[PDB]
Design a protein around this ligand. Structure first.
Ligand code: NI
Ligand code: NI
Lengths: 364, 364
């Protein structure tokens, strides 16, 4: 029944640790969590929060040339493990907590917690990775070249993750993420969109998915631009027909370049496909009746997803990195970074959602 | 105590009539509706709907050189009036209703109903205008040159309407509407945005408004584009200052062209203005707490407004045309156009809200 969940602690100067601790008792009832944190630091946060922690497994990570994972000892109802791995940085746990502040020390430490946990999951010691949020500016101050988890995951695993946001009532894949909105149009090409729609299906197996119009009213039958939507349509038909045919990546790469071959594929395609054939109008897409028609969406750009999504599911909304060799989930900071260790009230709903999501998937 | 409310019937072949008729008893309790429809066509609708209509005021309208507004007879508890005016086309009520169909004759009729109702309001015979939806394609087939209400209202009154969607919980002004999204960026200029925000304020008097970022995360301090946001800031700072100064239109046109004049205004009228100084992040803007912070917003593009607002306020959300010599409101098509006169369930909640909003306004 119990799957091992690897949890990287994020920036210790934020509300990450509080979430972790307050949630521990309920979380241990649904999976076995391993927390990537050394005891000395764990205790600094505990004392500062004035909370206690029972029956938890923590993993002290260290830089070594080889992989090695061992149970070491029990202590204060605490189970301590070590994981040695090639990190490329010397772990330094001896610094103080500085509530809500940007700091090179805790920056590097959290980057390392995450790197250690990611490879822990990659080596199959746990079933999935959950990352608590980090502050990119402390990474920057630590002299790291990465811009966030995704960038680091691309470097570790050489794959470009697909982001999917939301929860059971509504998930949305993002064709593009943190790029300026004036750049998104030229990125919507037949080649790129086809690869994305193929990978997104393979990664999720959703049975009925819909693309959101890029233009108002999905272009309104060509009167409000509509050029992007023609491309979307062409990509849907071709992906639909290709998934139905059960042919391989080699055929795909070849057919992406040959219209006559795409055409042959479309003429032989005798199914309803997995993607709706025509882009959705955003006006209708996030209403109750819209959501009942389709609740697995693909958005060409960041805000089309975020605005409606956070208006409905502020609490339970998770971030899911698809297309990597590990299952990785996350949550959004949500509050102000700087406003932490102050008994400010906290929402642990999304932490639980993200966990249950990962637990529910099949082994990679 | 009641104000007079002109109501144009939209496309008689759609659900407009039924809304009008199902709503009349309850509406007459808050205002005095004047419906713009000839008797013989009203009856064809009543019959086809199989409903009756009690103590309702209807205004037949006619092409003519002069503006004249007359009472004529009472009938089936049905006060019939005359309104003659320079319409441009010969009115023609002699046509049969075609349930849910595009037709030149109900299209042309519906345009004429609206033109009459609009001038009725301008010539002060009523307080406000409420337009029931039309179908742009029936307008096209009738040979009209206009693409919609706003298009025509610009021609009637030589003013560019500013559009505002929502309800008392949330209003969004639209800096652009049905233009291709790839084209929105170039349209965000200091000149155009300042005029917009000046007119938006003058028209609404809202004491606290926010602009929503164009780029994800409001450009994240210049890391995700940010160019558009610099321009927002520059406009916000200038308009705010102009509005405190109490200076006039002539000055404003002069100060738009001259950086030093702008600096002088900014030095003299520093201070919190009616616009928040920084664009808002769309992630946070539509949540409980966000809305509690600010609930009067301005969006740079159509879908940023439509998608979260229809997720929250599907039933109650209205359309308001600001910046015209008359008050004019409207609602969006509930159902598909196709499904009129079927006995499908019909939502009247926004019709009421729209009327409620107009009454609750001062005269013009
Ligand atoms: Ni984001
Ligand atoms: Ni629209």
């Amino acid at each position: 029944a119990m799957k091992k969940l690897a949890i990287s602690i994020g920036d210790i100067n934020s509300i990450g640790l509080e979430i972790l601790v307050r949630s521990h008792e309920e979380l241990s009832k649904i999976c076995t969590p391993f927390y990537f944190i050394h005891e000395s630091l764990l205790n600094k946060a505990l004392k500062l929060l004035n909370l206690k922690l029972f029956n938890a497994k923590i993993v002290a990570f260290k830089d070594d040339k080889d992989y090695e994972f061992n149970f070491i000892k029990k202590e204060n109802s605490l189970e301590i493990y070590s994981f040695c791995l090639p990190l490329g940085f010397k772990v330094d746990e001896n610094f103080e907590i500085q509530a809500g502040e940007i700091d090179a020390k805790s920056g590097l430490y959290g980057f390392l917690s995450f790197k250690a946990a990611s490879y822990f999951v990659y080596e199959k010691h746990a079933h999935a990775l959950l990352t608590l949020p980090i502050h990119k500016k402390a990474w920057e101050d630590a002299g790291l070249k990465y811009k966030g988890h995704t960038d680091a995951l691309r470097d570790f695993f050489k794959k470009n993750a697909i982001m999917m946001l939301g929860c059971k009532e509504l998930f949305v894949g993002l064709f593009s993420e943190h790029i300026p909105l004036a750049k998104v149009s030229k990125k919507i090409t037949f080649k790129n969109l086809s690869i994305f729609l193929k990978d997104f299906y393979k990664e999720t197996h959703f049975k009925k998915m819909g693309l959101l119009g890029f233009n108002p009213h999905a272009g309104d039958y060509g009167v409000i631009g509509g050029e992007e939507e023609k491309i979307m349509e062409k990509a849907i038909a071709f992906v639909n027909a290709f998934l139905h045919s059960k042919k391989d990546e080699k055929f795909f790469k070849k057919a992406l370049k040959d219209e006559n071959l795409q055409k042959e594929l479309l003429l032989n395609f005798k199914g309803k496909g997995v993607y709706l054939p025509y882009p959705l109008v955003a006006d209708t897409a996030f209403t109750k009746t819209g959501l009942k028609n389709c609740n697995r969406l693909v958005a060409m750009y960041h805000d089309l997803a975020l605005a409606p999504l956070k208006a409905l599911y502020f609490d339970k909304s998770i971030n899911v990195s698809l297309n990597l060799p590990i299952i990785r989930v996350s949550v959004d900071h949500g509050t102000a970074f700087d406003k932490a260790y102050k008994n400010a009230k906290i929402n642990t709903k999304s932490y639980f959602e993200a966990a249950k999501f990962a637990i529910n998937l099949h082994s990679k």
